[PDB]
Amino acid sequence: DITVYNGQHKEAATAVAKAFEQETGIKVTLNSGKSEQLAGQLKEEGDKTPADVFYTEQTATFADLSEAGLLAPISEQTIQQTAQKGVPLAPKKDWIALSGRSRVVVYDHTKLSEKDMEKSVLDYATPKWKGKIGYVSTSGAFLEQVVALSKMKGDKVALNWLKGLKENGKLYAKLSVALQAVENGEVPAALINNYYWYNLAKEKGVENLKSRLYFVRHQDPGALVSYSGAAVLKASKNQAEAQKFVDFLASKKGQEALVAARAEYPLRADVVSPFNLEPYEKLEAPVVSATTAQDKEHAIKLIEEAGL
Ligand SMILES: [Fe+3]
Ligand SMILES: [Fe+3]
Ligand SMILES: [Fe+3]
Ligand SMILES: [Fe+3]
Numbered sequence: 001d002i003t004v005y006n007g008q009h010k011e012a013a014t015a016v017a018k019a020f021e022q023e024t025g026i027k028v029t030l031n032s033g034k035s036e037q038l039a040g041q042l043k044e045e046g047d048k049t050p051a052d053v054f055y056t057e058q059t060a061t062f063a064d065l066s067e068a069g070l071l072a073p074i075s076e077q078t079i080q081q082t083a084q085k086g087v088p089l090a091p092k093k094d095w096i097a098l099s100g101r102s103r104v105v106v107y108d109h110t111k112l113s114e115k116d117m118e119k120s121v122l123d124y125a126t127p128k129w130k131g132k133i134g135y136v137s138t139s140g141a142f143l144e145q146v147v148a149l150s151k152m153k154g155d156k157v158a159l160n161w162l163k164g165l166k167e168n169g170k171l172y173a174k175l176s177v178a179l180q181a182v183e184n185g186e187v188p189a190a191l192i193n194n195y196y197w198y199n200l201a202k203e204k205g206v207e208n209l210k211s212r213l214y215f216v217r218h219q220d221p222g223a224l225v226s227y228s229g230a231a232v233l234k235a236s237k238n239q240a241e242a243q244k245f246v247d248f249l250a251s252k253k254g255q256e257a258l259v260a261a262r263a264e265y266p267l268r269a270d271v272v273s274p275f276n277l278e279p280y281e282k283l284e285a286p287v288v289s290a291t292t293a294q295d296k297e298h299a300i301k302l303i304e305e306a307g308l
Contacts, residue, residue: 002052007035015261060290082267095231099264121222125164134190146299162306195263225285
């Protein structure tokens with residue numbers, strides 16, 4: 001039996017855990033919380049951690065554990081199972097990217113078509129979208145987007161975009177609220193994450209939705225994907241079962257379990273999502289270095305400078 005510190009969505013972790021125990025007979029105990037909290041706990045606990053695996057929504061959280069010497073090597077053959085072009089790789093081969101979530105533009109297709117959409121996410125922060133583009137400055141993926149813009153285009157472009165949103169955008173408190181505002185006709189478009197639309201479409205039926213998605217693609221900053229993943233703790237005294245769980249997460253069956261529970265893009269090529277997601281490779285996501293705490297702090301300051 002193993003203990004998994006879980007930063008991923010609980011329903012998703014519960015589903016992959018249940019599929020693991022059904023396939024192997026090895027029981028999984030989840031200890032859930034926020035990834036950066038669990039990461040900090042794993043560093044404090046050090047060689048006395050009870051954690052066998054760290055399962056996360058954000059592979060950026062692994063960098064600090066890796067450089068603190070806290071993560072175990074995993075099999076190169078497992079890592080290759082999800083190593084599509086564009087997928088982040090652990091340089092020390094001590095964690096694995098498993099699935100992703102994408103930034104996207106949702107839009108009311110009864111008011112707009114793909115003709116009205118922009119080539120770059122940068123262009124939505126312009127006077128043509130005055131009063132007409134929703135955004136959610138508070139979510140974690142919004143912060144990652146700012147970090148991505150700074151790294152790919154510099155602080156001046158990132159700040160200009162934030163200022164553009166302040167002036168031209170409509171602020172919503174949560175992503176679900178932005179999505180509903182497009183559906184209900186309050187605003188013709190919003191910047192959101194993919195799974196919100198795919199979840200709504202699964203429950204209500206796409207035929208009953210006014211909104212559709214537009215992916216910028218072309219390695220645009222707006223094509224940003226955030227990656228979920230897993231690591232084995234070096235301090236684990238049950239390496240065989242821990243490695244077995246991570247191998248399972250990268251297997252056809254483990255990926256199937258994940259993609260049914262949550263509308264993340266699988267990173268195995270031979271797995272198809274029931275949420276009707278396009279293949280990861282078609283997103284054409286940019287390659288971006290992992291977010292550090294310092295990147296966050298810098299981005300937070302940009303958001304404040306822009307007036308939010
Ligand atoms: Fe969120
Ligand atoms: Fe959230
Ligand atoms: Fe989210
Ligand atoms: Fe959310």
